[PDB]
From a paper:
Following this pattern, the type 1 pilus usher (FimD) and chaperone (FimC) help type 1 pili assemble into a composite pilus structure consisting of a short tip fibrillum made up of the adhesin protein (FimH) and two minor subunits (FimG and FimF) that is joined to the pilus rod, a homopolymer of ~1000 FimA subunits. Once extruded to the extracellular surface, the type 1 pilus coils into a rigid right-handed helical structure that is capable of unwinding into a flexible linear fiber. This ability to transition between a coiled, helical rod and a linear fiber has been proposed to allow the type 1 pilus to act as a ‘molecular spring’ to maintain adherence in the face of fluid shear forces. FimA is critical for proper assembly of the type 1 pilus and, as the major subunit that makes up the pilus rod, is also critical for the proper display of the FimH adhesin.
To characterize FimA polymers that form the type 1 pilus rod, we solved the cryo-EM structure of native type 1 pili appearing in a preparation of recombinantly expressed Type IV pili (T4P) from the [name] K12 strain BW25113. The FimA reconstruction had an overall resolution of 4.2 Å, which is sufficient to build an atomic model of the structure. Overall, the type 1 pilus is a 70 Å diameter rod where each adjacent subunit rotates around the helical axis by 115° and translates along the axis by 7.7 Å. If we label each subunit along the 1-start helix by N, a subunit N0 interacts with six adjacent subunits (N-1,N-2,N-3,N+1,N+2,N+3). Further, in the structure we observe the N-terminal donor strand of one subunit completing the β-sheet of the adjacent subunit. Most prominently, the hydrophobic amino acids Val5, Val10 and Phe12 in the N-terminal β-strand (Nte) of one subunit are inserted into the next subunit’s hydrophobic groove created by a missing β-strand. Within the cryo-EM rod FimA structure, residues 25–29 adopt a helical conformation and residues 30–33 form a β-strand interaction with residues 10–13 from the Nte of the next FimA subunit. We can explain this by the fact that Ala22 in our rod model is tightly packed against Ala93 from another subunit and Val37 from a third subunit. Pili formed with the WT FimABW25113 protein require more than twice the force to unwind than the pili formed by the FimA BW25113 variant with an A22R mutation (~30 pN vs. 11pN), likely due to steric clashes caused by this substitution affecting the tightly packed interface between subunits. Interestingly, the non-conserved residues within the FimA sequences are all located on the exterior surface of the solved cryo-EM model, which is likely indicative of immune pressures selecting for antigenic diversification.
Numbering used by the authors:
A (entry chain I), B (entry chain K), C (entry chain E), D (entry chain C), E (entry chain A), F (entry chain B), ...: 3 to 158
Amino acid sequence: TTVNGGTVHFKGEVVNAACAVDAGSVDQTVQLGQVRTASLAQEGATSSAVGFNIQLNDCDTNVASKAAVAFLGTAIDAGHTNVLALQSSAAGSATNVGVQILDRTGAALTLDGATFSSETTLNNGTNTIPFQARYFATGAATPGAANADATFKVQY
Amino acid sequence: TTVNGGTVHFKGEVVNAACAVDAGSVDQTVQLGQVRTASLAQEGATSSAVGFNIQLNDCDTNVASKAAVAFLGTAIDAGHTNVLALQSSAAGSATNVGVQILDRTGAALTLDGATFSSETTLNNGTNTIPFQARYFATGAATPGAANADATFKVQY
Amino acid sequence: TTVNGGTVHFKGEVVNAACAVDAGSVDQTVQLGQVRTASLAQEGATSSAVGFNIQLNDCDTNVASKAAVAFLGTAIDAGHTNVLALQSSAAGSATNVGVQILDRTGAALTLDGATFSSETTLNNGTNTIPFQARYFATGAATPGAANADATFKVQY
Amino acid sequence: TTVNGGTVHFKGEVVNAACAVDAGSVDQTVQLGQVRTASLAQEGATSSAVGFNIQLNDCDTNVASKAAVAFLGTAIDAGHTNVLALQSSAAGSATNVGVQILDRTGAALTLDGATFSSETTLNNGTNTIPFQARYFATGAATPGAANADATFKVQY
Amino acid sequence: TTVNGGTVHFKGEVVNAACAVDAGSVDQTVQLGQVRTASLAQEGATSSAVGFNIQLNDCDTNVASKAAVAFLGTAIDAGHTNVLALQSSAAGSATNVGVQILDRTGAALTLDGATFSSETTLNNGTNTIPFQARYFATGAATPGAANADATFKVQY
Amino acid sequence: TTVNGGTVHFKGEVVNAACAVDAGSVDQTVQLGQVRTASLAQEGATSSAVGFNIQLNDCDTNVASKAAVAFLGTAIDAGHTNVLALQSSAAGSATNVGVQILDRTGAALTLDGATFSSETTLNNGTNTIPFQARYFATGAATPGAANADATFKVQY
Amino acid sequence: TTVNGGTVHFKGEVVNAACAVDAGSVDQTVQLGQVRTASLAQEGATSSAVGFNIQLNDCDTNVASKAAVAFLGTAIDAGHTNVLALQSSAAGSATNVGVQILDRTGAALTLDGATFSSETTLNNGTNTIPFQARYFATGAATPGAANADATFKVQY
Amino acid sequence: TTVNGGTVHFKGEVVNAACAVDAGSVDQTVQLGQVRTASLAQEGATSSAVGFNIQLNDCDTNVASKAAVAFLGTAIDAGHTNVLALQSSAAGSATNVGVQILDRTGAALTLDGATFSSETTLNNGTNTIPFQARYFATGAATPGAANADATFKVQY
Amino acid sequence: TTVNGGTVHFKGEVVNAACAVDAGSVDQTVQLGQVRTASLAQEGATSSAVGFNIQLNDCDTNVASKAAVAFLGTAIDAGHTNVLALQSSAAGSATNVGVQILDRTGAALTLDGATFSSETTLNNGTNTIPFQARYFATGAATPGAANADATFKVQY
Amino acid sequence: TTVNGGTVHFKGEVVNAACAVDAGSVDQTVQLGQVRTASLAQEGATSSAVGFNIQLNDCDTNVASKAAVAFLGTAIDAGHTNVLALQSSAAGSATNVGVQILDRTGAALTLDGATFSSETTLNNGTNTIPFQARYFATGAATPGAANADATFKVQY
Amino acid sequence: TTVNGGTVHFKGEVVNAACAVDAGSVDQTVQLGQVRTASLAQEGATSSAVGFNIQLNDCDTNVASKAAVAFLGTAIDAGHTNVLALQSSAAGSATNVGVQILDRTGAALTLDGATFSSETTLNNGTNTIPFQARYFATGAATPGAANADATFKVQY
């Protein structure tokens, strides 16, 4: 007495390099929280800040004992190259505001897909490259939904 | 020697009001536990009860030294307005049963998104508004999976 | 060295009213699950039930601090006005069965496009109006594929 | 005991260049959402904004380690060269409004099929070039259906 | 106050056999993607490969607990009987290239309308017979549009 | 250096009434699927059923806040006035079978061009009037091609 | 045992120039929709607007990296040179109305067969030149059938 | 109050054999497209190629489970027996060029009315025998209109 | 430098009544298809059946909100008054066979020019009165060419 | 064993000028349709209007890059020089009515054989000069058959 | 003041058997991760491995106290019957590699839709059948995107 179920959908990658990503760690999701224009209403204001993490597994330091990352993603302005713009349904989200990411070095990384981060040190096996998320305003902000996306390119 | 990773997805909000939510505290998840119809099989039975928590951070009492919450969510019946109904895949979950939430005041709150809770007192900075979860039956219950959802609206 | 790609297709609406829909939330898709005639074979049986959600964004309560919804869609019978009939390729799907939706009030809503739901309370900004999906049989059911569709009209 | 079925229709391209498009990513569809003239009724208003994505696969950086895109599509006006006009059945859609796309650089791209975007950096293999969609009004807008189309030309 | 609309056109089949096709699943359309001669320029090269699906519904295993498929369609050569040739407007599409389909068994099926596939196992109700599409070159290929068609005959 | 192309052919209507049809929605085409006489071989059998949709755009409720539809088209018999007969090349299609359409009310509508449907409720702007297609046999059916046509008259 | 069938009729062109047309794309047909005099009853009114597309294939930019189009077709008036008049059986169609086409530039093109459009940019291979169709009234319009035709001349 | 209309003209055939043709499928018309001498200017050049289809309906495999086709039509030369010549008004069409048809086997079929094609396999009911149209030059071609005709004889 | 062309020949009618015919719709031509004596060899056999259409335009319901049609044409026999006989060159066509037309009511209409059809309902403007063509044998048929003609008289 | 057939009759022209006519396009026949005195009963009434086409082939723009047409034919009155009178068997056709032709410019052309039309632009090869036919009454019209003829003179 | 929203689309099944699937658990998606050819470049190599889960709900052991699963899906080779092949856009994904699934028994299951798994033990209510995903190479692998699909058939 057999029956039908449905469909399964596996994902992943195959990439020939030093480390290997737990792509859930990249596809990891964050809830930065609920934020106010009471503080984040200035051309330069940084709200308080929240952590982010990366996971690598089973890594050979001989191919590359080091690593870094570049990001891309829709930035706001040519004078705010390290800021990420938001992506939610139209007429909903906020304005005069973006998102900033901080390296291990506390560094505002550019969204170009070239601006590689600091050369992380890699052990054998497993590592972690934590970044710290926050908002970096671009003037008096709108009370709006906040939702974003950025692509995770890596250097070894 | 660069490589691809994948996608990142940040979340949050921007809301101009007194306090600011750690939206993980709202998106906080509970495992109430495994429960029996041995006790929860009556039009009025309350199973034993479990705690729930809220987190606010960096709050100015001058905008609002107080706060409260209304909830909404699929209730069961018009005579059981303070009960929450369950949301799991069909043919699986239980019946003749719902969920109750209790305020700081031990109060059965309504699921309408208007029925604001007790006016919490707010300090400067950080606060906590714990609620207590439990089941509130609506007759002899089914042995079924229990899974729910409710939206978290706030007053300041 | 340029090349061809292909076509892009954007969608949306422009509607002058209080709130604004994340039309992905309406075009949101559900997988209620796999269900049995072991329970859903009666003129009145309700299978266990699953949740559904709505999203509004950047809403002014002054235009309308409230809101509701009517639905339409192919119902089955004039004596089952709150039931939705199924829409899959012919000779495949089930029979003597439909679908029910439940309001926040646990209410069997009619498929007419007029039967507005309960007057939701609207904050400023962003809200959620969860409904709960389930099957509502119309006698002993066929083992058949289950697939449906309903249109999402709104009141403010 | 054989029977008839029907017709199948495969699609694709063959193009000799650096990367190769997942033409579903171009033929990718967006639901920007439902939008209001409450905000989008000005010669310059930008509604809140939503994300868009591109996919390339199995790319050799030696042919071209870089890439960009030009778009074409029916724009509205010669003074609004970066705006896209809407394409739905006549007498239905809105007016005094169009659509804007934003580069990774937050750039209003022209609809000519020549105005190549920023030179994306390409790794080996797989990349992503996210754009951000929104409306850019051209005065007080009509409440109308919103539906669009734009062609996706690429530079390597 | 009545008005004119226009014409409707329904389609389908009536076939007396074990299963019944969701002829949208056959008339299902694929966008394999954009492909390069950088890899697909050899008498035998297989580009990377994409999936395809079939849908049957409400099937009796007693008439036939099994099933298979033959295809026909314009192949290229008598020495490439399992390859499908392309069908787009003249002077546009590519050359020295075709299309291959793969069975559940990873099998290059012939385009004759007789070469029945592997005997799929059929449950009661609903099934799926996924195939995998790709290109199978016949020498150094032209950069050209790629567009195809194949007829879907079935065995029970 | 100019050249010849060919001919273009636009279509449409101009009708002075409440709503306006996206006549593609009427000229919309359906593939109901492949169907069996295993179930559809009775004077009254209804095969499983598939959905159909209508689109109106930019509608004023003041001219008419309501609407309905009558259909015409070659029916089979005077005792089967709500059934549609099939229209394919002769000696090909099936027999002892027709097609049924179901209103929003699940109603077998007559093919006369007068039998107006239920009075749909019309909002401002855009609406949808989904119908559900299926076969309604007239005895033991032939295995034959199934192809139909019906005209779409409207009431406001 | 042979039999008769009938006649086949192929079509096309042979033209020595840069690109080559998919003459189905020119002979492409549109259903603009059903339209009202409620809006289109003014000497200058533009109904909402619908898209149109062109297809070129296997194009050499060295012969001509650019291209444009002129149209001809029965216009209405010498003061409405960019308007197309309608062509349906007599006493049927509407009056005090025509049709407008819009370039990629949103430009009212003349029906002369000389007024070449904007110089499109041509890649190698395949391109698309979308136009946008709509009605451009010439006073209070008749409720009448709408049907048109225009010839597609090209510049390289 | 009766009136005159006009004349109707039905067509068809009556032929006693295995299958039965949808003679619209034979009388089916193709628009191969617009083609260039840039590629089609050689004694042997094949332009890129487009598909063609056939339709049979309600076929008994017992009379003949197989089928094929011969063609006739004005060919060009005794050394180009598989080429079709063009038929348009004099002084208009092209020269040093013809048309080729390809079988399911990718076979240049002769225009004699005897050269039967590959023995297609016939199911019960309905089948399809797709051919692929293209040009096969006979030297440097004229830029001329392209228009053709060929008769469709069948084997069972 | 003028030249000669040739002759033009316009046609039509002028008739004072409710609706007005698109006399192309009457002079519309059908290709019913190729048919077999395998089924159509009985005193009463009806081959499978194909559709036919009528077009009226710009109609006033006040002169006549209704309409119908009578036909005439060479019938076969006084006992087969609803059958149409065939008209092709002598010694060619078939025998023991005719043609049947079916009303919207599925009605065998008489060829007399008096037997008015069902009273169609007429809207304002444009309507359609589809009929369905098929063969109605008069015994074992000849394999012969099939070609017919019938005159289209109308009632308002 | 030879037999007799009959007579063949070819036609055409030989004219030394820029373009060459597909004299079927001139000898092309139109069925304007059935028309009413309900609208066409005024000294100036124009019924709704239908299209007409011309075909030229293999044209050299160097002899003449331009072209136009004059018409002649039996007009009605010296005050209605642009109207064409009707030519059917006597006592049959209508009266107080004629026919009008419209240029590409929407121009009432004179029937003299001198009044050359607008200077069409000619490409190389093939062109089209569409005109639009309609009736232009000369008072209250008779219900009568409508049939006409006009000669097609050309300028280069 | 009502407005339009959009469309909803529910899904599911109705199947008469012991347990009932949370078809989200089948339609559950996995991100296995990013993988290297540094280890997965051998005819037999198994990369490290990741978990997968199933969900059943409200199950009666009396109909069936046991259960198992067969899978189907495009495998690679007849000598690698337990391997799943990948399905992403062409020219993108990897090669000389597939995917393996492991039963509760650590068993390489076949993709046939018949090879039922181990007989799971079923309690009353709710169960879980975890599988473990990994790659099983077929030689030295390509660095390519990895994406798959497999159908979930069940035994009770």
